[PDB]
Amino acid sequence: SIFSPDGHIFQVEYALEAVKRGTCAVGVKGKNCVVLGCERRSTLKLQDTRITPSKVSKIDSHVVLSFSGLNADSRILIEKARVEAQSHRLTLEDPVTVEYLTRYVAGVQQRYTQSGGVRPFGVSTLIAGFDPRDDEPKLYQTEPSGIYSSWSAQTIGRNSKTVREFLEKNYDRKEPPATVEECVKLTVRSLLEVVQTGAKNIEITVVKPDSDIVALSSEEINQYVTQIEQEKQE
Amino acid sequence: TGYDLSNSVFSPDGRNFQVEYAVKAVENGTTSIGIKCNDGVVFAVEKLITSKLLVPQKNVKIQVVDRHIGCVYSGLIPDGRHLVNRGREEAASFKKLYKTPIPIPAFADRLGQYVQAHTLYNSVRPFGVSTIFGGVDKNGAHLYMLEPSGSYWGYKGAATGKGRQSAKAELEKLVDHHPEGLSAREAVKQAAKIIYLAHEDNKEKDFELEISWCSLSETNGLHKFVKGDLLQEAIDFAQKEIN
Amino acid sequence: MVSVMKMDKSPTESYSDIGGLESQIQEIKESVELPLTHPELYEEMGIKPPKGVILYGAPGTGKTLLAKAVANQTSATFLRIVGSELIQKYLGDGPRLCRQIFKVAGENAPSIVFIDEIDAIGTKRYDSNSGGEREIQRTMLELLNQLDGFDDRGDVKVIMATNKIETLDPALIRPGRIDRKILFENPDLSTKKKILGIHTSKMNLSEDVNLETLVTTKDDLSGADIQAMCTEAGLLALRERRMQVTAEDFKQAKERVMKNKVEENLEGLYL
Amino acid sequence: FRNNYDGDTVTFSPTGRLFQVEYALEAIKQGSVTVGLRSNTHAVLVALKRNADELSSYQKKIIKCDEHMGLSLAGLAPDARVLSNYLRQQCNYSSLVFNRKLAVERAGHLLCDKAQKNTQSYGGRPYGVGLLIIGYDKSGAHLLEFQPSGNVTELYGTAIGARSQGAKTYLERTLDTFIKIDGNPDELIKAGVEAISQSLRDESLTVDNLSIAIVGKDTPFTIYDGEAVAKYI
Amino acid sequence: DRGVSTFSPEGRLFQVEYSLEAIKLGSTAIGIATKEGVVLGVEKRATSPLLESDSIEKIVEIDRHIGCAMSGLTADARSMIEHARTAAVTHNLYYDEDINVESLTQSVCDLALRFGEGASGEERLMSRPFGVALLIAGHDADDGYQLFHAEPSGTFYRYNAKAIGSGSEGAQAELLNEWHSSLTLKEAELLVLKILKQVMEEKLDENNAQLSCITKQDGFKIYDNEKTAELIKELKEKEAAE
Amino acid sequence: DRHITIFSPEGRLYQVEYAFKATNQTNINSLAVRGKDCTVVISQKKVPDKLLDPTTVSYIFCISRTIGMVVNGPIPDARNAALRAKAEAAEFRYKYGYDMPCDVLAKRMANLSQIYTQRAYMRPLGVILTFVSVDEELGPSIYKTDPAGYYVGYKATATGPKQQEITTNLENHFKKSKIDHINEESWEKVVEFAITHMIDALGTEFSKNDLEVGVATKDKFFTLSAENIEERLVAIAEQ
Amino acid sequence: LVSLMMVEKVPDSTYDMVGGLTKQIKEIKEVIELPVKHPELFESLGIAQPKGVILYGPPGTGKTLLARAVAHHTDCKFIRVSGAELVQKYIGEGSRMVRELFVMAREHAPSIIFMDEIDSIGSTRVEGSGGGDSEVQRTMLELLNQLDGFETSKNIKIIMATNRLDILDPALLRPGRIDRKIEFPPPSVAARAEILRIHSRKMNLTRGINLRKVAEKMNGCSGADVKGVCTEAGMYALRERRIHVTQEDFELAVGKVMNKNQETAISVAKLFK
Amino acid sequence: SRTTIFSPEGRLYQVEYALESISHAGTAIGIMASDGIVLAAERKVTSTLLEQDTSTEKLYKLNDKIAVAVAGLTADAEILINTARIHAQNYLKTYNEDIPVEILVRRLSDIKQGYTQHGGLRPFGVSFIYAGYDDRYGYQLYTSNPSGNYTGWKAISVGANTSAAQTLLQMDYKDDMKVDDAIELALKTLSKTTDSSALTYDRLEFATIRKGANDGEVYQKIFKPQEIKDILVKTGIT
Ligand SMILES: Nc1ncnc2c1ncn2[C@@H]1O[C@H](COP(=O)(O)OP(=O)(O)OP(=O)(O)O)[C@@H](O)[C@H]1O
Ligand SMILES: Nc1ncnc2c1ncn2[C@@H]1O[C@H](COP(=O)(O)OP(=O)(O)OP(=O)(O)O)[C@@H](O)[C@H]1O
């Protein structure tokens, strides 16, 4: 993995296109709440989804993740991330921040760049959650080059171009998401443009303080999606 | 063609041409000889000057490995010096052992397999040098030459550089003239003749000479360069043989 | 040579009946038509509008349908040739003939031309040491040098075509000459939108419409086959004698024809 | 036309050449000049400096090893630096193991034994510069030449790099003269300085584009850069 | 189709000299010296509005009194600053005193040389070299507010002031024309804005850029989103006047 | 494929068939037999220049006070094999308390050649060998090696570019008296049969220096010198 | 040239010599039959009398032997190229003939063509290696779909054919440029049953005959094997001087297929299970 | 071909060959009722002289609650079992409880990309079937591939036309489909996909899981030739 004469890298002008194939997901930064939302294969028959590895994953009592792209190269990070979580709670006696492990894993995706015979990932991820003993939301986005950012909304996947600009006709800085019913309406009113099917093809999750995690049924989705399946009419 | 690109790739002919290219590198170097006298050995070498700015007599090309040895080379200046720095510690790790100086067959048996090791692998450069050494042990006189394929044989005389064709036939013209035995001092005359006789392949340029011998008789079989009128006695002589 | 050239017989291909797109199509009318509407505007800011364009391939996805629609609209000449028909046994015959167009383009200020599938002319500059085939390479040089030796551009217009570019076409094209290297490929919805926007004209759908689900699930395909999709419903009508227009048998054609050309579908790996 | 024997090092030519090396030695040809010479008692370093713009400070050309040694380089700094930091250990090691302080010429005969340990192993390039070493010991003063080859030689005075033949020629014009100098380094120094004007492609030396630093049978190593060299221009 | 440690017939290496134009893809990053203080400036390359540009950090703080600004490829340089922080603090231990700048910065450019025969006894880390370069600013009590420049080829120069990146070849010319000895600090807190307003692809905001001074009295200081804005009006106090 | 020790497209090893031919650089032929309670081994000794010290030249080595060997190949390649022999005798008896046989020690160095065909850091060796010894349990015996690992005894054999010239000539002999080895006791009085057979079958006449000799005497191995050969040559005074 | 042209000497085949093939005629005649039988009927809707069609399937079928009979019971002409004869060892000969080709059928609307093989005009790629043949596939397709082809597609339907499908240019097919394709698979057993009824019409008041008792057994692909076994069955009777024939003499003729049904030797390589 | 790097457009050169290569291999299916489990495999060869009787190749076990099936190399899979076996009982000398699967695969297949990730070494030409039970999630079923991504299912195939064969389970499978009501689907799932419709009890291999022993014990029952030979008649082949 070397430098082209166009200031680029061959293998990494490539890799981040891999994440542009697979599933599509997003979260946001509500007024006082934070949420995620992702994708599933409807029509996957002869199967029980209780036990499949969810695109969501949890890392601590109070933080979670949502990958995209590959699935193998995702599982590895959670492990060595989990280590740093339930180790950082020990030596220093305080739990994590959000930026710490983000700063960490921002570094590991180049420790697996600059060496001999090591591919980078077909992975891009983001995180979300509230710091301990605070209230302000925090979410950070990642990609194999290591550059960790803080997007108020971030999506990686298929048909995502207009999705990357769909929010900008929808979100307002000085008009943030009021409540969950609208902020989740936001969470779904984005993703549904690529869904092209019912509720079965997705999975979502949410955070509130002091580790108030929830996951919502296929049926709870069929409560609210109808309300805009009713309001996609007038 | 396509097999002539790296070490350790034999040919259908049954060879690796790469070292055979090394022979032309050492062909691109200075003249150098060393003679088996009646009681020791001799060393003498070509040392060409480019500009006057080069100092005389501060830039020897002979190297010593231990007391009872002299060694020279021709071609690649550094590479022929490396194995000396291997030589200078090896025998030192042999006088370490039975507390006696080292034989000359001990030398090549502890060198002539070394350079071989730099022709087994696809990761190193064959020592593009031909090399001489000599001296004395309990047994008596010895002499040897090396070639970069590890080989070596006990000669009465040798030659390298582009001073090959002159000296070889000349020594053929010498030996029959004097097979009875040639003592130390006398060859120091007749040696420096040959270098003045062998520069004619490169008589565009200039040089100055450098000589060393070692006698069981004279110097207790120790190594001792030349520095004195004895050298000047020979250059005054060697001009006559070309006169 | 002249015989094939003057194809003044535009079909009933109806420009603006086609429902494809706009921006491309203004881009040509802006390239061509509006320059023939009030070109003083180019003289206002002092513009030399372009010397024709080049679309790309993506076959069966709307290479030409506009073009004969433009011919239906052309309001000028229209020309048509083939390089394979242009070439001959002897040396420089066609090259001697290739010159003879531009004077026949010098015929008119309303001087325009389509060209037919260059893929055997000017493809790529192999050395062609292997005999014979240097004729092609000897011919393209007879054109491009003729094209821009010393030309006021004389409304010496052009529009070209192919099916694949990077397969060929290394150096022939140059900007200004052909500034607009432009595209046609699948819309990802608008085949659903305006294609049957056209084909709703004749048919009745004699029980319903059903069109709210006779639709695209981001299905990789080419809407050109939609003119099969209309077909076989009528046939399957008459595989069972339906003189009317159904929506139910219409199902099969996508389930039948779109199902043949299968893809790998290896996306049990990017989840 | 396209020598495939141009890749890694170890590949000899079909004529006895290492095309990496020969194509390296032209580097210093694209580098600048730094000259030097000696009497029987005093030796000199000299170096044009090569500046970036009208704002920057200047690229350096001289470094001290230790109290009785200095040097000067040509072409590349970074691969040339480490050799300086290298032999400091091999000049401290002397003055702590022995205290019988360091003779100059063995350093070169150490230094040649370094680069050769970098040519004949896969990976690694030569320390591709030429450079000039100076100093004093019990044996008088000595000057040296360096090649990334390994060749190092005891010279009276020489030159390096671009435009250098003009200055190189003054020395053969003058080697009868400057060898007989002693205890009077001032006029000695301006020998090269006048002589390297032969190189000036109208850049017209200044207070600061030049660096000089010398040694003697008495002097420890001293540098004359900054603004002290109004003496000479 | 070249490698790392192989020369050319021309001598000019390929990869490192190719590493000397990746910077020209990146952002802009300028710092200018005044004999009573030095400035630093940036171009965020903010791509979308929803983003919260407090998180993007093209500017750092080594200590209470030294800062730097990375340009080109912001990712990789995030590593090397932790090197500098280690040697700074380490030198703050063995001597109980802040370090000279030139003692530090030799180290950093002694790091990026590690891709083959680094300092004395260096195992070759860094399969490839750092595709990033940066500027160093701060005081030590021997030479003055000696700015320093670093580039991954493994050399440093000292400057009055210059630039990097996108606007390099053009912008510096104005700086080459318009620096001298006897200027102020805040004139340099605003002269950059005359420049950076040139080579931004949109009208300036208080959030496109941000600034940070440096002073032997207080030490290090980043400004706020608004305290850039007030001086821009001060620039428009001259852009509207003249 | 034609530069390394992978398996060929069809399934030979082009880098190895070369190595057999890397031996034939010298135009040299050697020979091996079994005595009654002794053995013999010989080869040409060419000297196409005047200045050598043929005191020094040799291919026939000395590994114990028991055994010996020979080479028809490049001697630099030989010496690395030569040295590794002396080692691999010692470490045997130091671990078991008795001298090194031949049948084993070939079975070592034959194992060794394989892991020069099974890896690629290594250059193989363009030589072959014919070890010679008595054995207190097996008697007079020899063993041959290739660079691959094929090692086998021989009641009597030879090697060089010109095996066909003589190897037929020997098989014709045993089809004339029909026993394994010779019915003659003293080594001194059977070397004549060797040198009688070389020049006659297809070989060229020889002189004093032209040849060299080894004998694996009972509890003794050793070479021979000038008059020791010249005398043994003058056995031809009677025939 | 008119040697390629159709014939006043039609072959003598028929699409009821063709047992087992029952459905395909209904699926493919109409595009070749109906709207050209009744354009006013089709023009009642007038969707698109499509361009030609294509047939894919292995050998053993008689796709040819189908195409021989369709040229009987036509109302139209049936020309033949004698596939790949059109090309010559030159360049200019390509496009002119194709120019000559279409026009030869413009003058005959109720008339169509035949290919057998398009393995030799497939999958054009070029970087210096290629050939003039790729030049001609364009202009035919050009004059297939251009200002002058739909007037043929007003007058014409056509067909292509081969035995290997996916080894050609997809840029050929704009579906609509070819509006329908079909498989000619190998037969069923009972589909094979009525076959031998066709060709063995040689029994002589014989008995003990179980025509079903052979596709009883077969797992082949061809229908022609029904002839290959039948044709050499009578050879036995031909040699033994008795014209008559039976089941068992007819059955061991599969012994000739004992090679074909078993010529495919097998590897023992259990590298992977 | 430099296993590490990607395509010019985000793909791999090797590994897409591997899970496409394994399609050459045999068949191994695996299903589940709410009552019990079935497995099957068709041996690549069923010649007569060799020891197809005790030929335990496609179906191995790991402990007294688990069984698997195999698809790929004889050897490069033959080591993983000796590996993973240890990671089972080495779970036990720490904790002394029985092992769950959901730790195993997630803590096993991550070895896979470890050889895609570095070393220049090839990945593993292997895919698995899984089967077993824990007291916390009931009966179970899982699969794998040379990548590492694992997927839970109710019934699956691999190998020859597994995409085709997976259809054959699509319509017929039932939620409460019992064991003896589901077993016959398997060999019927194979009775169609076979190359040799001429079918032999010899050619295949079989396994079972139940909870047959009262007091909630289970049975890693594996079935011998003449048994399944007679079972074969039950669905009515001959
Ligand atoms: N937007 C559209 N509306 C209607 N038909 C379309 C559309 N796009 C493509 N088609 C169909 O595609 C077919 C041909 O399209 P296209 O112009 O790409 O190829 P072509 O010009 O026939 O091929 P060639 O140029 O090689 O002769 C037509 O039959 C047409 O019905
Ligand atoms: N149902 C059938 N009716 C009549 N003939 C058949 C039938 N099935 C097979 N055949 C025979 O098959 C032969 C040709 O079929 P096959 O597909 O093997 O070759 P082909 O179609 O001539 O080859 P190609 O299509 O490549 O030119 C004819 O001899 C024909 O008699």
Distance CA A94, CA H118 (A): 36
Distance CA A39, CA A47 (A): 16
Experimental method: cryo-EM
Q: What angle do CA D5, D8, D13 make, to 5 degrees?
A: 30
How distant is the Cα of A103 from the closest Cα of chain E, in angstroms?
A: 10
Task: Calculate the CA F98 to chain-centre distance.
Answer: 24
> Which chains touch D (3+ CB pairs under 8 A)?
B, E
Q: For residue H85, what are the contacts with CB-CB under 8 A and spacing of at least 6?
A: H62, H63
H139, H32 contact by CB (below 8 A): yes
Which helix (H) or strand (E) element contains residue B107?
helix B104-109
Q: After which residues is chain D broken (C to N over 2.5 A)?
A: none
Distance CA A47, CA G105 (A): 58
Could you tell which of G64, G160, G189, G222 is best to mutate to test the pocket of ligand 2, judged by most ligand atoms within 8 Å of the CB?
G64
Residues of D in contact with E176 (CB under 8 A): 53-55
Atom of ligand 1 nearest to the CA of C163: 26
Of G116, G32, G14, G22, which Cα lies nearest the Cα of G72? G14
Own/partner contacts of E56-64, CB < 8 Å, gap of 24 or more, are E56/A149, E56/A150, E58/E27, E58/E29, E59/E210, E59/E212, E59/E222, E61/E220, E61/E222, E62/E88, E62/E138, E63/E88, E63/E89, E63/E98, E63/E219, E63/E220, E64/E219, E64/E220
To test the contact with chain C by mutation, choose from G99, G136, G138 the residue with the greatest count of C C-beta atoms within 10 A, namely G138
Here the tokens at position G65 are 């032997």
Residues of C in contact with A75 (CB under 8 A): none
Q: Give the experimental resolution in Å.
A: 4.7
Residues of C in contact with A196 (CB under 8 A): 217-218
Q: How many inter-chain contacts (D to E, CB under 8 Å) are there?
A: 69
What SS3 state is found at A46? Answer: coil
The burial class, CB within 10 Å (0-12 / 13-18 / 19+), for G255 is exposed
Given an 8 Å threshold on Cβ–Cβ distance, is E117 in contact with D118?
Answer: yes
Do strands H66-67 and H61-63 pair parallel, antiparallel, or not at all (unpaired)? antiparallel
Distance CA H234, CA G127 (A): 63
Here the tokens at position F78 are 């030989």
Given an 8 Å threshold on Cβ–Cβ distance, is E120 in contact with D55?
Answer: no
Positions at the binding site of G for ATP: 57-64
Residues of D in contact with E162 (CB under 8 A): 53, 55-56
Report whether residue G65 contacts ligand 2, using a CB cutoff of 6 Å: yes
B30 flagged as catalytic: yes
| Cα-to-centroid distance, G59 and ligand 2 (Å) | 7
DSSP H helices, chain F, are 14-23, 75-96, 102-117, 163-177, 191-201, 226-233
Report whether residue C195 contacts ligand 1, using a CB cutoff of 6 Å: yes
Question: In sequence order, what are the beta bridge partners of F157?
Answer: F32
Secondary structure of chain E in the HEC alphabet? CCCCCCCCCCCCCCHHHHCCCCHHHCCCEEEEEECCEECCEECCCCCCCCCCCCCCCCECCCCCCEEEEEECCHHHHHHHHHHHHHHHHHHHHHCCCCCCHHHHHHHHHHHHHHCCCCCCCCCCCCCCCCCCEEEEEECECCCECCCEEEECCCEEEECCEECCCCCHHHHHHHHHHCCCCCCCCHHHHHHHHHHHCCCCCCCCCCCCCCCEEEECCCEEEECCHHHHHHHHHHHHHHHCCC
Could you tell which of G134, G172, G173, G174 is best to mutate to test the pocket of ligand 1, judged by most ligand atoms within 8 Å of the CB?
G174
Here the tokens at position A113 are 């760049």
CATH number, residue D109: 3.60.20.10
Partner D contacted by E119 (CB < 8 A)? yes
Report whether residue G60 contacts ligand 2, using a CB cutoff of 6 Å: yes
C-alpha dihedral (A155, A158, A162, A164), degrees to nearest 10? 10
Of C154, C148, C139, C157, which Cα lies nearest the Cα of C88? C139
- Taking CA–CA distances from A46, the nearest residue in chain H reads H154
- Dihedral of CA G183/G188/G191/G195: which sign? positive
Tell me which residue has tokens 């002091």: A210
> Which chains touch G (3+ CB pairs under 8 A)?
C, H
How distant is the Cα of E51 from the closest Cα of chain A, in angstroms?
A: 5
CA–CA distance from B33 to each of B157, B181, D16, G204 (Å)?
Answer: 7, 18, 21, 109
CATH number, residue E198: 3.60.20.10
- Phi, psi angle pair for A175, to nearest 5°: -135, 65
What SS3 state is found at B45? Answer: strand
Here the tokens at position H11 are 């793909």
Here the tokens at position B68 are 């009872």
Distance CA C117, CA G138 (A): 7
Q: How many domains does chain D have?
A: 1
Report whether residue G186 contacts ligand 2, using a CB cutoff of 6 Å: no
* Amino acid found at C116: D
Of D121, D112, F109, which Cα lies nearest the Cα of B118? D121
Do strands C180-181 and C53-54 pair parallel, antiparallel, or not at all (unpaired)? parallel
G141: region left, alpha or beta (phi > 0 left; psi from -120 to 50 alpha): alpha
Distance CA F101, CA D69 (A): 63
Secondary structure of chain D in the HEC alphabet? CCCCCCCCCCCCCCCCCCHHHHHHCHHHHHCCCCCEEECCCEEEEEEECCECCCCCCECCCEEEEECCEEEEEECCCHHHHHHHHHHHHHHHHHHHHCCCCCCHHHHHHHHHHHHHHHHCCCCCCCCCCEEEEEEEECCEEEEECCCCCCCCCEECEECCCCCCHHHHHHHHCCCCCHHHCCCCHHHHHHHHHHHHHHHCCCCCCCCCCEEEEEEECCCCCEEECCCHHHHCC
A29, A137 contact by CB (below 8 A): yes
CA–CA distance from B119 to each of B112, B128, B145, F148, G52 (Å)?
Answer: 12, 11, 18, 19, 70
Q: How many domains does chain E have?
A: 1
C138, C32 contact by CB (below 8 A): no
| Cα-to-centroid distance, G149 and ligand 1 (Å) | 13
Distance CA A44, CA A54 (A): 15
DSSP H helices, F119-190, are 163-177
Q: How many Cβ atoms are within 10 Å of G100's Cβ, its own excluded?
A: 12
Distance CA F154, CA F181 (A): 10
What SS3 state is found at F16? Answer: helix
Q: Which domain holds residue E49?
A: 1-242
Distance CA D178, CA D191 (A): 8
| Cα-to-centroid distance, G67 and ligand 2 (Å) | 10
Q: Which domain holds residue D110?
A: 2-233
Task: Calculate the CA B72 to chain-centre distance.
Answer: 4
Of A22, A194, A197, the CB nearest to C270: A22
DSSP class per residue in chain G: --TTS--SS-----TTS-TT--SHHHHHHHHHHHHHH-HHHHHHH-------BEEE--SSS-HHHHHHHHTSS-SSEE----TTTT--SSSTHHHHHHHHHHHHHHT-SSEE---S--TTS-----SS---THHHHHHHHHHHHSSTTTHHHHHH---B---S--SSS-GGG--TTTS--EEE--PPPHHHHHHHHHHH-TT--S-----THHHHTT---S-STHHHHHHHHHHHHHHHSS-----HHHHHTTHHHHHHHTT--------SB-
Given an 8 Å threshold on Cβ–Cβ distance, is A47 in contact with H170?
Answer: no
Secondary structure of chain H in the HEC alphabet? CCCCCCCCCCCCCCHHHHHHHHHHCCEEEEECCCCCEEEEEECCCCCCCCCCCCCCCCCCEEECCEECEEEEECCCCHHHHHHHHHHHHHHHHHHCCCCCHHHHCCCCCHHHHHHHCECCCCCCCEEEECCEEECCCEEECEECCCCCCCCECCEECCCCCHHHHHHHHHHHCCCCCCHHHHHHHHHHHHHHHCCCCCCCHHHEEEEEEECCCCCCCCECCCCCHHHHHHHHHHCCCC
Packing angle, helices A99-111 and A72-91, rounded to 10: 130
Question: In sequence order, what are the beta bridge partners of D135?
Answer: D69, D142
Q: H6-41 burial string, b = 16+ CB within 10 Å, else e?
A: beeebebeebeebbeebeebbbbbbbbbeebbbbbb
Q: For residue F239, what are the contacts with CB-CB under 8 A and spacing of at least 6?
A: F192, F196
The burial class, CB within 10 Å (0-12 / 13-18 / 19+), for H171 is exposed
Question: In sequence order, what are the beta bridge partners of B152?
Answer: B146
Partner E contacted by A174 (CB < 8 A)? no
Q: What angle do CA D176, D182, D184 make, to 5 degrees?
A: 110
Distance CA H169, CA H189 (A): 7
**DSSP helix, strand, coil percent of chain B (3-state; round to 5):** 35, 20, 45
Do strands F30-34 and H132-134 pair parallel, antiparallel, or not at all (unpaired)? unpaired
Q: How many Cβ atoms are within 10 Å of H92's Cβ, its own excluded?
A: 12
| Cα-to-centroid distance, B177 and ligand 1 (Å) | 101
Report whether residue C227 contacts ligand 1, using a CB cutoff of 6 Å: yes
| Protein residue whose Cα sits closest to atom 13 of ligand 2 | G62
- Taking CA–CA distances from D37, the nearest residue in chain B reads B53
Task: Calculate the CA E230 to chain-centre distance.
Answer: 24
Strand order in the sheet with B129-136: B69-75, B129-136, B141-146, B152-153
| Protein residue whose Cα sits closest to atom 3 of ligand 2 | G18
Report whether residue G228 contacts ligand 2, using a CB cutoff of 6 Å: no
Could you tell which of C65, C193, C226, C230 is best to mutate to test the pocket of ligand 1, judged by most ligand atoms within 8 Å of the CB?
C65
Query: Rounded to a whole number, what is the largest CA-CA distance in chain E?
Result: 61
